[PDB]
Amino acid sequence: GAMEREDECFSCGDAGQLVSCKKPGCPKVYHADCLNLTKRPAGKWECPWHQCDVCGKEAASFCEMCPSSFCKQHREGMLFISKLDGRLSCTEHD
């Protein structure tokens, strides 16, 4: 993190061997295993929660229930506000 670092994996909902994002505005942490980080990131690492789950490009919207964020193109119709808590939820959370 660059301000704080929560002690739970946003991907799994579990805590453990966590690697934190080194980008400002990101308090989130994840497991290297669930991220498929076979290669150990060196230096500034940006979590895939900044990457569009569809095209792999930079995400503009962030699903608040999974590391599947979306770009300006792949966010339309794919991400919506959950009426349960007001959190951004993607269509893949049935």
Tell me: does residue 66 bind Zn ion (CB under 5 A).
yes
Among 51, 62, 67, 90, indicate the residue that binds Zn ion (CB under 5 A). 90
Contact 45, 21 (CB under 8 A): yes
> Binding string, 44-63, against Zn ion, x = CB under 5 A?
---x----x-xx-------x
Q: Which of 21, 70, 17, 80 lies closest to 46, judged by CA?
A: 21
The first and second tokens of residue 26, run together, are 């990101």
Q: Name the DSSP class of 49.
A: G
Q: Which residues bind Zn ion (CB under 5 A)?
A: 9, 11-12, 21, 23, 26, 31, 34, 47, 52, 54-55, 63, 65-66, 68, 71, 74, 90
